[PDB]
Amino acid sequence: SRSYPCDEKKQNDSVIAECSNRRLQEVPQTVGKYVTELDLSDNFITHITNESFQGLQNLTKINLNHNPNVGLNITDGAFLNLKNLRELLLEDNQLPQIPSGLPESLTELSLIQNNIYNITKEGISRLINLKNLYLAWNCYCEKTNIEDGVFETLTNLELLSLSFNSLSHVPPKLPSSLRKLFLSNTQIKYISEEDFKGLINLTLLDLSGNCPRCFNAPFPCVPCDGGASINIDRFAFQNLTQLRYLNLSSTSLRKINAAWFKNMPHLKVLDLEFNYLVGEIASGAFLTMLPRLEILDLSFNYIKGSYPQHINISRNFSKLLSLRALHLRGYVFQELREDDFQPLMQLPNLSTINLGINFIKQIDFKLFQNFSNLEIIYLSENRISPLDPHSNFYHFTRPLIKPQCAAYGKALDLSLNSIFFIGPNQFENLPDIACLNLSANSNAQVLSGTEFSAIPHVKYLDLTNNRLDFDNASALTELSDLEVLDLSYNSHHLEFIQNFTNLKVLNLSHNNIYTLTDKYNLESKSLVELVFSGNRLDILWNDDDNRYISIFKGLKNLTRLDLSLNRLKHIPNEAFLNLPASLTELHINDNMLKFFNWTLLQQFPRLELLDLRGNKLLFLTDSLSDFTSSLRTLLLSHNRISHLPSGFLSEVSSLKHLDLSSNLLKTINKSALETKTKLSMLELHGNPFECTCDIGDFRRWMDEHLNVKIPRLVDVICASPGDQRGKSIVSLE
Amino acid sequence: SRSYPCDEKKQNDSVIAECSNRRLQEVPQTVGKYVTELDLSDNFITHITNESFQGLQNLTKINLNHNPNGLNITDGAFLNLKNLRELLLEDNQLPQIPSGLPESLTELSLIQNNIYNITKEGISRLINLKNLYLAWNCYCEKTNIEDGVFETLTNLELLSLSFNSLSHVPPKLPSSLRKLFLSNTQIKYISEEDFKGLINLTLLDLSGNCPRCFNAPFPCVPCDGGASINIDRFAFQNLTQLRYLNLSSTSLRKINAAWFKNMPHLKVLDLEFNYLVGEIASGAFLTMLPRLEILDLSFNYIKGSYPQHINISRNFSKLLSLRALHLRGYVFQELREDDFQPLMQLPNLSTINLGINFIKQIDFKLFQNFSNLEIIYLSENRISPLDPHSNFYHFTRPLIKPQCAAYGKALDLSLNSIFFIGPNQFENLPDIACLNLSANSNAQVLSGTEFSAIPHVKYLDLTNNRLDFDNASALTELSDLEVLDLSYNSHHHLEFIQNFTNLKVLNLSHNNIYTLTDKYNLESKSLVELVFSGNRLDILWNDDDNRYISIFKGLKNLTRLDLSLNRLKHIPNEAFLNLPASLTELHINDNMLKFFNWTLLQQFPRLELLDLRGNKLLFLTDSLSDFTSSLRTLLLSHNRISHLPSGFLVSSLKHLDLSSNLLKTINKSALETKTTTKLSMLELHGNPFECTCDIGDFRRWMDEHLNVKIPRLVDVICASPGDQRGKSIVSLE
Ligand SMILES: *[C@@H]1O[C@H](CO)[C@@H](O[C@@H]2O[C@H](CO)[C@@H](O[C@@H]3O[C@H](CO[C@H]4O[C@H](CO)[C@@H](O)[C@H](O)[C@@H]4O)[C@@H](O)[C@H](O[C@H]4O[C@H](CO)[C@@H](O)[C@H](O)[C@@H]4O)[C@@H]3O)[C@H](O)[C@H]2NC(C)=O)[C@H](O)[C@H]1NC(C)=O
Ligand SMILES: *[C@@H]1O[C@H](CO)[C@@H](O[C@@H]2O[C@H](CO)[C@@H](O[C@@H]3O[C@H](CO[C@H]4O[C@H](CO)[C@@H](O)[C@H](O)[C@@H]4O)[C@@H](O)[C@H](O[C@H]4O[C@H](CO)[C@@H](O)[C@H](O)[C@@H]4O)[C@@H]3O)[C@H](O)[C@H]2NC(C)=O)[C@H](O)[C@H]1NC(C)=O
Ligand SMILES: *[C@@H]1O[C@H](CO)[C@@H](O[C@@H]2O[C@H](CO)[C@@H](O[C@@H]3O[C@H](CO[C@H]4O[C@H](CO)[C@@H](O)[C@H](O)[C@@H]4O)[C@@H](O)[C@H](O[C@H]4O[C@H](CO)[C@@H](O)[C@H](O)[C@@H]4O)[C@@H]3O)[C@H](O)[C@H]2NC(C)=O)[C@H](O)[C@H]1NC(C)=O
Ligand SMILES: *[C@@H]1O[C@H](CO)[C@@H](O[C@@H]2O[C@H](CO)[C@@H](O[C@@H]3O[C@H](CO[C@H]4O[C@H](CO)[C@@H](O)[C@H](O)[C@@H]4O)[C@@H](O)[C@H](O[C@H]4O[C@H](CO)[C@@H](O)[C@H](O)[C@@H]4O)[C@@H]3O)[C@H](O)[C@H]2NC(C)=O)[C@H](O)[C@H]1NC(C)=O
Ligand SMILES: *[C@@H]1O[C@H](CO)[C@@H](O[C@@H]2O[C@H](CO)[C@@H](O[C@@H]3O[C@H](CO)[C@@H](O)[C@H](O)[C@@H]3O)[C@H](O)[C@H]2NC(C)=O)[C@H](O)[C@H]1NC(C)=O
Ligand SMILES: *[C@@H]1O[C@H](CO)[C@@H](O[C@@H]2O[C@H](CO)[C@@H](O[C@@H]3O[C@H](CO)[C@@H](O)[C@H](O)[C@@H]3O)[C@H](O)[C@H]2NC(C)=O)[C@H](O)[C@H]1NC(C)=O
Ligand SMILES: COc1cc2cc[nH]c2cc1-c1ccncc1
Ligand SMILES: COc1cc2cc[nH]c2cc1-c1ccncc1
Ligand SMILES: *[C@@H]1O[C@H](CO)[C@@H](O)[C@H](O)[C@H]1NC(C)=O
Ligand SMILES: *[C@@H]1O[C@H](CO)[C@@H](O)[C@H](O)[C@H]1NC(C)=O
Ligand SMILES: *[C@@H]1O[C@H](CO)[C@@H](O)[C@H](O)[C@H]1NC(C)=O
Ligand SMILES: *[C@@H]1O[C@H](CO)[C@@H](O)[C@H](O)[C@H]1NC(C)=O
Ligand SMILES: *[C@@H]1O[C@H](CO)[C@@H](O)[C@H](O)[C@H]1NC(C)=O
Ligand SMILES: *[C@@H]1O[C@H](CO)[C@@H](O)[C@H](O)[C@H]1NC(C)=O
Ligand SMILES: *[C@@H]1O[C@H](CO)[C@@H](O)[C@H](O)[C@H]1NC(C)=O
Ligand SMILES: *[C@@H]1O[C@H](CO)[C@@H](O)[C@H](O)[C@H]1NC(C)=O
Ligand SMILES: *[C@@H]1O[C@H](CO)[C@@H](O)[C@H](O)[C@H]1NC(C)=O
Ligand SMILES: *[C@@H]1O[C@H](CO)[C@@H](O)[C@H](O)[C@H]1NC(C)=O
Ligand SMILES: *[C@@H]1O[C@H](CO)[C@@H](O)[C@H](O)[C@H]1NC(C)=O
Ligand SMILES: *[C@@H]1O[C@H](CO)[C@@H](O)[C@H](O)[C@H]1NC(C)=O
């Protein structure tokens, strides 16, 4: 009952069949009839007929995106026999028109990135149950021909996306049940009062990219003739009472009419980025019309060729009583004064201030104490000195600060600034900072133990991409509550580490650590994770340089250790035995290990994950079960292992995941797989299998052991013979 | 008489022999007896005996550096060479100085060896020694020098003992010494009797003794208690002819003026990597140097401080002979006009180096107040809108590229914070002829008025920026502009180019030019060289779009054109014929060209160099002479050419490159040139030659045509047969 070529999974009673990226030329006739969701995306399927989904009555969702993957010929009524089909996805298929004969039961239809120039009633008006319709990126053709009243019959339509299409005008006769109308980059330069007259339940209106302001756009950007903005009429939004999301990004707006928000009391998210609103930020009459706005974005609204001394924030910003996040990137100003941000100081819920990419030379950091609920202060990409069509293209969705850092408390991001050394007054008058980012600052500070005295409760410190000197034993010790220290890519004396009573995670990756002075051991009673990748452990472990045999022995509470990219060819037996006995996860991947003494794994009873990927290992052990009794995951991919030993899949019941992909395995004999096993996953793709009569012994083991899920069966290829080269091992005589 | 394995050349009557980097296991017995200079460096030679240089009486210079890439040299191995004047034994792992060296030696270099003892047994016999290099030997058990080992060397002019654990200056040095190198020698104390008998010494290098560790490329260990080198008041009282004093990295805090009382000729003083901020402010020693031309006080900053101004002593005005002032790494916020007043009356001060100073603002009017300023180096600052044979402490490379500096006054504002050209950016600046605004993240929309305060700029470097030059008036205010460098420019309309009447060189490399607006051509009556590498000419030339077939046709005066890295697979015939007929040098290297129509070369009568390296060309033309009549250099290396056609060897072709191709053999009919050819160089290394009986026909052509110099004969390898694999084609039968 092993599924091929799809990977069947019974996720929450319904069976999902992952059949994507498998070089399938046609729809497989070996998919189980009980499946409900089929994903055949990124394949080379060229034809879709009414005999492609035979016996699949329970199919509710079909994904046929990117077919063929670098058009698709669908016949009329090809999906009509699927009475339970509620979700059809046909993105990037080069379809010349909307497929005729789609089932009435459909609710979610996505025809993004196609050659559809005409929206006719022949293929849409029959779909009365449609709730979500995506028709983006079709005319990006002089204009998209939309039949007058094509969406009128779709009385259940809640989402209509017509973005990235040459529309010129808002389509008339839209259903009153619409909640989300997407019209981004549609060449609609004028908005009339009757364009959204019958849309009283509309909660989202995206009119971005119309008369754009070209600023590093990832798609063609053509500004309006005479530098004109989108012409929104005074009474255009007078009937959108439930509107909560207004996206007016990249619309070249110079003035914001307050009359637009008179009948909009619920507006929650306003996007005014990539416009010319420096004057509107200074005066702002519209600011008094948004009492329930939580997210305001006025990013990249700068005047080209000017670098003002101060940011001009209107007093009316104090009327934004519900404000939670203020995004003010790309304003371009030299100094942030305490009086500049006075209107924002009495807002009860303002937790995020985004001031990235502003070229600010100096900030009066005392002003941040004067805020009530500030949790995130984003100041990245400034000049502070010492002492995918399914994406939001205009607003950054990713968290400004890494959630792991922000979870500790108040976060301040001063990365990518001009702090070439930590000044003596660097952190004076700052709030109780718990998360600090000083990444990529070219900071050549000689840390002595007094630099972070003004903010000593920092629990997460990011000092990556700097030239710091932490050879002093007192370095960073003033941060007694420090739990996460990130020193990656820092261009030795690691005594400072033992002074921390609550340090849990330390990252010393790519520090080029080839020598250690005085205290040759790294001690710590609280450290749980150490990242030592990108260092020179090969130099530290020599025939005469035996001083570093117990380098990580002092880390008695360590559970995760990363020793990758260390150019390790050989690991001394005494050095391996001196690793923390408390280790549960060890990574020695991407090295040049010729040999691995599996006997030494006896002194690690808690070790669950051993990662030896990307190495030159040639042989394994037949008595692996005698050494370990807890190893649940063993990753040995991209190695030179040519033979799997006898009894490898037996007596080691702890092993649930075994990775042996991209190795040199030609065959798996009966004596080697003689289990006299709780292995739920065995990876074997990318091996030069000999698909002759002796491979049938391993094939029989796959039929008897159906619980051992082997992923990527289409990639388990045969090297020999010539007649079976390029085929899967499961497809044999 | 074709030399093997060396490349002999009778350079200025004396015959040189380049035999380096040829994987030679032993000294070749096939070197001509008439040669005078043998270079066997970077080989795998392990033994040097007295029978290694038999019959080589005219040998005056032997280079045996890096062998093997230690070396076993017997006693008196070079004694039979009566004319040996120069012996080079660097990086050979020699345990001691080779015994039995010829007394005729004048230059001896034993750098990077394991020589711990300097004995009279191997040195005192060499009485004609003029240059002795013993650097990098104990870098270690402290270097032992026999008392008076150099005393007998009465002709010794240069003695280098740098990078050795000396602790003290060696006593009994010859009075004929002119250059004493003692850098990084752990000599912490200098006594009045250390250089008592060295009256003719013109150079004294005492750098790296008590170092100031600042990104050193070698072990740096500072003196106990942060002490400086202890130079006595009367230590330099007898060095009257001293012209070069290197005191770099010596942790000096005070400079005693008494050191330069009897030093009236001192020309170059190196005081970089010290703690002389206080000495730069007061400077009593400045009145003792009236003939100093080069002063370097770089990286003398106080750690942890960022002063508002640079404190330059009034005594700097007494440096009447000063030509170059290097003041990097001082670390200051502002350069005022009054700060550089002492330097304004110096008649010969042409170079001011102020790199890596983190200067926020400069009063640029002060540069007008200088008399002979030619180079103003301000790279790596914060200006806002509106190898043992090397000098390891001072930058020898020119601050500004000579090509730029040759035009006149040069100003280097590269790697600064000029994110856009301000309206007052170049006001009050001298008549600038060379300007560097590289790597400034400048997103300026060039309109034609930005460089109106410095309109005589003839060489402009705007590389690594985000400039917008789509306007036809861009840069046109620089009427005398001759060289424009726009390499690596992110964020096309190239009309501005035709407005320049004297533009000669234009570099548009790595601009990602895949589309050109309305003016689909590039016109210019003065342009001579165009660099279009790293662009998308493959996109500009296609089956649907034929609008750019005459893109470079308007460049009627062009002689050099670079079209490399353009991802070119095919070049349309009409597009190739529309290239400038005045072209003398064309480069289409590192592309993916499957075919090349050699017939089209008839419309280029001035073309001398055709570069088609790194392509996928499979075949050549049988009648190449019929198409071209001036092609002197043809580079076709790294291609898929498997057969050279009959009659391939044009009475113009002087250099033919066919290396790293797929040539198995060269038939008689291909090299049967009946007429006299002028081919002086033919490269053929890296080809899979079949060293069978058929290859003897090409071997006979090499013996008859000795004038056709074939370089790298050791790399012309045989692929087949197994007995000849790895051998040169000239070593067969
Ligand atoms: C103008 O401004 C508007 C308003 O902000 C923007 O609208 C947003 O547009 C994006 C798409 O461009 C929407 O994001 C997508 O939402 C889908 C639905 O979300 C609901 O359901 C999920 C559960 O499935 C809930 O978690 C969620 O809270 C919602 O209730 C998601 O399914 C999408 O996720 C998929 O794509 C992302 C990105 O590739 C992946 O990371 C995911 O793993 C997943 O595969 C996606 O998040 C967003 O919801 C819209 N907002 C609203 C309020 O509707 C416009 O995009 C903007 N215009 C431009 C041009 O920028
Ligand atoms: C220096 O070194 C540190 C320490 O290694 C690095 O920081 C860690 O980085 C990793 C990513 O490389 C982080 O791991 C990720 O955490 C995400 C958030 O964790 C929460 O959510 C998960 C459930 O999703 C919970 O189990 C968990 O308890 C948390 O509540 C996870 O969502 C991520 O998992 C997903 O991705 C991985 C692949 O990345 C998959 O394997 C998973 O199956 C899953 O799909 C992931 O685990 C980790 O949290 C960071 N730790 C800290 C302390 O910050 C630094 O990045 C490194 N610095 C540099 C410059 O390299
Ligand atoms: C402390 O300060 C002193 C004074 O400045 C420094 O001394 C210089 O040291 C460097 C070597 O480290 C010297 O440079 C070398 O000079 C050789 C001789 O030059 C003479 O001969 C050539 C012709 O052959 C003339 O052009 C020249 O004017 C001189 O008359 C050169 O032969 C060397 O060239 C070779 O090496 C370089 C670098 O690899 C290559 O580019 C060349 O192609 C060639 O292979 C080289 O230039 C320099 O001359 C010394 N100055 C003086 C006045 O003697 C100390 O180095 C400095 N200490 C430290 C530690 O930095
Ligand atoms: C953007 O594009 C421009 C134009 O191509 C580049 O600028 C040129 O860069 C090249 C180097 O890549 C420069 O060429 C070199 O010039 C040296 C100085 O020239 C003088 O000396 C020679 C004799 O040595 C005279 O014939 C000449 O008339 C000058 O008086 C030469 O010494 C160099 O030759 C040596 O090196 C080359 C290999 O590089 C060997 O082939 C030679 O045999 C020889 O050993 C060399 O010719 C050129 O001068 C620059 N031109 C200008 C206008 O500045 C930019 O570099 C490029 N920008 C970027 C970022 O890539
Ligand atoms: C401290 O500040 C630095 C600089 O802002 C942060 O580094 C940035 O972190 C993000 C997320 O890890 C990186 O983005 C990633 O880029 C790759 C490549 O495009 C992409 O594949 C990923 O999906 C992701 O978007 C970003 O490149 C990186 N920038 C630099 C210069 O390193 C850092 O995360 C901050 N630390 C904390 C604790 O917030
Ligand atoms: C304008 O300013 C920029 C920035 O200073 C100059 O670019 C720099 O040019 C030099 C010389 O070509 C490069 O130096 C080289 O570095 C390598 C590696 O260390 C070294 O091996 C070479 O011998 C040489 O020293 C330097 O890397 C490069 N820097 C950057 C950021 O591109 C540019 O040359 C200046 N232009 C003019 C006209 O002076
Ligand atoms: C948001 O504005 C910028 C962003 C970047 C990034 C690099 N360079 C920049 C320049 C600017 C800018 C500022 C003012 N006037 C013109 C351009
Ligand atoms: C020349 O001084 C520096 C150079 C660099 C380069 C990166 N960061 C730096 C910092 C400094 C500095 C200045 C003053 N006090 C301490 C350190
Ligand atoms: C569809 O699912 C039901 C259970 O919900 C099952 O009885 C039926 O047999 C399935 N249909 C097919 C074709 O397997
Ligand atoms: C602040 O935000 C919280 C949700 O995070 C909300 O419950 C609360 O009512 C908001 N306060 C005001 C005054 O709007
Ligand atoms: C906080 O801001 C107010 C003005 O809004 C100002 O009067 C006050 O002095 C500031 N707080 C402190 C502690 O100075
Ligand atoms: C370490 O830092 C302390 C605190 O500033 C300082 O006193 C000490 O000298 C430093 N240690 C070394 C070895 O320089
Ligand atoms: C070990 O680490 C855990 C998790 O950080 C911590 O709770 C525990 O206290 C540590 N154990 C000791 C002995 O410090
Ligand atoms: C494994 O380690 C033990 C203990 O150091 C040693 O005796 C044994 O010989 C090692 N085995 C291999 C194969 O290196
Ligand atoms: C050395 O050179 C002279 C000419 O200067 C020549 O007569 C003599 O034969 C040469 N010696 C050898 C060994 O070739
Ligand atoms: C200035 O330098 C030139 C050489 O470049 C020299 O001839 C001249 O004498 C110098 N002037 C003075 C006053 O030293
Ligand atoms: C040049 O410097 C002198 C002082 O050295 C100053 O008096 C003079 O005003 C400056 N020149 C100009 C043009 O201001
Ligand atoms: C080009 O530059 C000129 C000069 O400033 C300006 O007037 C013109 O508007 C610019 N052209 C375009 C197309 O913007
Ligand atoms: C062509 O270029 C040369 C060299 O730059 C120049 O001297 C000459 O005047 C140019 N010819 C024409 C016709 O402009
Ligand atoms: C070379 O170019 C000429 C002129 O366009 C054309 O007639 C000829 O067929 C071309 N030859 C090849 C081999 O493409």
Give A487-501 as a DSSP string. Answer: -TT------GGGG-S
Q: Which two tokens stand for residue A70?
A: 């670098």
In angstroms and rounded to an integer, the radius of gyration of the C-alpha atoms of chain B is 31
- Residue A345 beta carbon below 6 angstroms from any ligand 11 atom: yes
Dihedral angle, C-alpha A491, A494, A495, A498, nearest 10 °: 110
Phi, psi of A122 (to 5 degrees): -60, -40
| Burial of A572 from C-beta contacts in 10 A (0-12 / 13-18 / 19+) | middle
Amino acid symbol at A501 = T
Task: Say how many Å lie between the CA of residue B5 and the centre of ligand 3.
Answer: 31
Contact A185, A163 (CB under 8 A): yes
* Distance (Å, whole) CA A665 – CA A672: 12
| Mutate: best of A361, A471, A493, A512, partner B, most B CBs <10 A | A361
Task: Say how many Å lie between the CA of residue A386 and the centre of ligand 5.
Answer: 23
Contacts of A446 in chain B (CB under 8 A): 303
| Burial of B703 from C-beta contacts in 10 A (0-12 / 13-18 / 19+) | exposed
- The residue whose CA has the least distance to atom 56 of ligand 1 is A392
Nearest to A454 by CA among A426, A435, A419, A474: A426
DSSP string, B293-337: -EEE--S-PPTT---SB----GGGGG-TT--EEE-TT---SEE-T
Q: What are B193-200's contacts with CB under 8 Å, separation 24+?
A: B194/B168, B194/B169, B194/B235, B195/B169, B195/B235, B195/B236, B195/B238, B195/B239, B196/B238, B197/B173, B197/B238, B198/B173, B198/B238, B198/B239, B199/B175, B199/B238, B199/B239, B199/B240, B199/B241, B200/B175, B200/B176, B200/B241
- Residue B507 beta carbon below 6 angstroms from any ligand 4 atom: yes
| Residues in CB range of B131: below 8 A, 6 or more apart | B106, B107, B108, B109, B157, B158
* Distance (Å, whole) CA A505 – CA A485: 6
Amino acid symbol at B590 = D
Nearest to A281 by CA among A219, A358, A349: A358
Contact B36, B63 (CB under 8 A): no
Q: Do B386 and A307 touch (CB under 8 A)?
A: yes
Contact B548, B566 (CB under 8 A): no
Phi-psi region of A395 (alpha: psi -120 to 50; beta: other; left: phi over 0): beta
Nearest to A225 by CA among A275, A273, A277, A189: A189
Nearest to B690 by CA among B650, B668, B723: B723
- Residue A502 beta carbon below 6 angstroms from any ligand 14 atom: no
Contact B25, B714 (CB under 8 A): no
| Residues in CB range of A688: below 8 A, 6 or more apart | A664, A665, A666, A719, A720
* Distance (Å, whole) CA B258 – CA A640: 71
Q: Do A421 and B385 touch (CB under 8 A)?
A: no
In chain A, the residue whose alpha carbon lies closest to the alpha carbon of B381 is A418
Helix (H) or strand (E) holding B280: helix B277-281
* Distance (Å, whole) CA B87 – CA B110: 9
| Residues in CB range of B526: below 8 A, 6 or more apart | B500, B501, B502, B503, B504, B557
* Distance (Å, whole) CA A215 – CA B386: 22
* Distance (Å, whole) CA A466 – CA B511: 30
Supply the DSSP symbol for A703.
H
Nearest to B411 by CA among B460, B452, B344: B460
Q: Which two tokens stand for residue A391?
A: 């994406």
Q: Closest CB to B306: pick one of A305, A359, A386.
A: A386
* Distance (Å, whole) CA A162 – CA A181: 8
Breaks in chain B (C to N > 2.5 A) come right after 69, 139, 386, 491, 649
| Mutate: best of A421, A425, A445, A512, partner B, most B CBs <10 A | A421
* Distance (Å, whole) CA A340 – CA A354: 15
Q: Which two tokens stand for residue B149?
A: 């080992």
- Residue A449 beta carbon below 6 angstroms from any ligand 12 atom: yes
Q: Is A591 helix (H, G, I), strand (E, B) or coil?
A: coil
The number of residues making up chain A comes to 733
**Ligand 9 first shell, C-beta below 6 A:** A 33-34, 55, 57-58
Give chain A's contact residues with B (Cβ, < 8 Å).
216, 304-305, 307, 334, 359, 361, 383, 385-387, 418, 420-421, 423-424, 446
Do the bridges between strand A61-63 and strand B432-436 make them parallel or antiparallel, or are there none, so unpaired?
Answer: unpaired
* Distance (Å, whole) CA A531 – CA A519: 19
Convert B105-130 to b/e letters by CB count within 10 Å (16 or more is b).
bbebbbbbbebbbbeeebbbbbeebb
The number of residues making up chain B comes to 733
Task: Say how many Å lie between the CA of residue B408 and the centre of ligand 19.
Answer: 21
* Distance (Å, whole) CA A265 – CA A454: 43
| Residues in CB range of A626: below 8 A, 6 or more apart | none
Contact A507, A482 (CB under 8 A): no
**Cβ neighbours around B517 below 10 Å, total:** 10
Count of pairs with CB atoms under 8 A, one residue in A, one in B = 36
Q: Do A446 and B303 touch (CB under 8 A)?
A: yes
- The residue whose CA has the least distance to atom 9 of ligand 13 is A526
Helix (H) or strand (E) holding B131: strand B131-133
Contact A455, A428 (CB under 8 A): no
Amino acid symbol at A330 = G
B718 Cα distance to chain centroid: 35
- Three-state secondary structure along A109-163? EECCCCCCCEECHHHHCCCCCCCEEECCCCCCCCCCEECCCCCCCCCCCCEEECC
Distance between B422 CA and the closest CA of chain A, angstroms = 7
Contact B552, B583 (CB under 8 A): no
Q: Which two tokens stand for residue A165?
A: 């299409």
Distance between B304 CA and the closest CA of chain A, angstroms = 7
Nearest to A213 by CA among A254, A264, A175: A254
| Burial of B501 from C-beta contacts in 10 A (0-12 / 13-18 / 19+) | exposed
| Burial of A717 from C-beta contacts in 10 A (0-12 / 13-18 / 19+) | middle
A598 Cα distance to chain centroid: 37
Task: Say how many Å lie between the CA of residue B56 and the centre of ligand 19.
Answer: 54
- What's the half-sphere exposure (Cβ side, CA atoms, 13 Å) at B657? 17
- Residue B640 beta carbon below 6 angstroms from any ligand 15 atom: no
Amino acid symbol at A50 = N
* Distance (Å, whole) CA B153 – CA B300: 39
Task: Ligand 8, residue B303: give the atom nearest the CA.
Answer: 15
Contact B224, B184 (CB under 8 A): no
Contact A540, A566 (CB under 8 A): no
Task: Say how many Å lie between the CA of residue B424 and the centre of ligand 17.
Answer: 21
**Cβ neighbours around A212 below 10 Å, total:** 23
Contacts of B304 in chain A (CB under 8 A): 421, 424
- The residue whose CA has the least distance to atom 4 of ligand 18 is B447
| Residues in CB range of B25: below 8 A, 6 or more apart | B43, B44, B45, B46
| Residues in CB range of A489: below 8 A, 6 or more apart | A464, A465, A466, A509, A510, A511
Distance between B480 CA and the closest CA of chain A, angstroms = 26
Contacts of A216 in chain B (CB under 8 A): 491
| Residues in CB range of A495: below 8 A, 6 or more apart | A473, A518, A519
Strand partners, A74: A48
Q: Do A216 and B491 touch (CB under 8 A)?
A: yes
* Distance (Å, whole) CA A314 – CA B11: 80
Contact A64, A93 (CB under 8 A): yes
Contact B180, B173 (CB under 8 A): yes
Breaks in chain A (C to N > 2.5 A) come right after 70, 140, 387, 491, 676
Give the Cα-Cα-Cα angle A200, A119, A114 (nearest 5 degrees). Answer: 110
Contact B98, B74 (CB under 8 A): no
* Distance (Å, whole) CA B228 – CA B583: 62
* Distance (Å, whole) CA A441 – CA A416: 5
Q: Which two tokens stand for residue B115?
A: 């020589």
| Residues in CB range of A226: below 8 A, 6 or more apart | none
Task: Ligand 10, residue A348: give the atom nearest the CA.
Answer: 13
Give the Cα-Cα-Cα angle B329, B331, B332 (nearest 5 degrees). Answer: 140
Query: Is the C-alpha dihedral spanning B541, B547, B550, B552 positive or negative?
Result: negative
CA distances (Å), origin A22, targets A43, A231, A245, A689? 6, 49, 40, 19
Task: Say how many Å lie between the CA of residue A392 and the centre of ligand 1.
Answer: 7
Q: Closest CB to A304: pick one of B358, B422, B445.
A: B445
In angstroms and rounded to an integer, the radius of gyration of the C-alpha atoms of chain A is 31
Phi, psi of A628 (to 5 degrees): -105, 155
Helix (H) or strand (E) holding A575: helix A573-577
| Residues in CB range of A509: below 8 A, 6 or more apart | A488, A489, A531, A532, A533, A534, A535, A562
* Distance (Å, whole) CA B698 – CA A582: 70
Amino acid symbol at B312 = I
- Residue B57 beta carbon below 6 angstroms from any ligand 15 atom: yes
CA distances (Å), origin A546, targets A137, A520, A572, A573, B252? 64, 10, 10, 12, 38
Task: Say how many Å lie between the CA of residue A444 and the centre of ligand 8.
Answer: 6
In chain A, the residue whose alpha carbon lies closest to the alpha carbon of B444 is A305
Q: Is A538 helix (H, G, I), strand (E, B) or coil?
A: helix
Amino acid symbol at A373 = N
* Distance (Å, whole) CA A491 – CA B617: 45
| Residues in CB range of A173: below 8 A, 6 or more apart | A148, A149, A150, A151, A152
Nearest to B14 by CA among B2, B32, B40: B32
Task: Say how many Å lie between the CA of residue B640 and the centre of ligand 19.
Answer: 39
* Distance (Å, whole) CA B649 – CA A683: 58
| Residues in CB range of B279: below 8 A, 6 or more apart | B252, B253, B254, B255, B285
Convert B218-242 to b/e letters by CB count within 10 Å (16 or more is b).
eeeeebeeeebbebbeebbbbbeeb
Convert A470-500 to b/e letters by CB count within 10 Å (16 or more is b).
beebebbbbbeebbbbbbbbbeeebbbbbbb
Q: Which two tokens stand for residue A14?
A: 């319904």
**Cβ neighbours around B421 below 10 Å, total:** 23
Helix (H) or strand (E) holding A718: strand A718-720
* Distance (Å, whole) CA A339 – CA A351: 19
* Distance (Å, whole) CA B462 – CA B435: 9
Q: Which two tokens stand for residue B480?
A: 């005398």
A385 Cα distance to chain centroid: 32
- The residue whose CA has the least distance to atom 49 of ligand 2 is A404
* Distance (Å, whole) CA A182 – CA A158: 11
Contact B126, B152 (CB under 8 A): no
Residue recorded with tokens 């200056």 = B169
* Distance (Å, whole) CA A462 – CA A507: 10
Nearest to B206 by CA among B239, B150, B249, B243: B249
Residue recorded with tokens 């002479």 = B625
Nearest to A191 by CA among A212, A214, A168, A163: A168
Q: Which two tokens stand for residue B469?
A: 């030059």
Supply the DSSP symbol for A644.
P
Q: Closest CB to B385: pick one of A216, A307, A387.
A: A307
Q: Which two tokens stand for residue A675?
A: 């289990």
- Residue B556 beta carbon below 6 angstroms from any ligand 19 atom: no
- For chain B, the straight-line distance linking the first and the last C-alpha, in angstroms and rounded, comes to 16
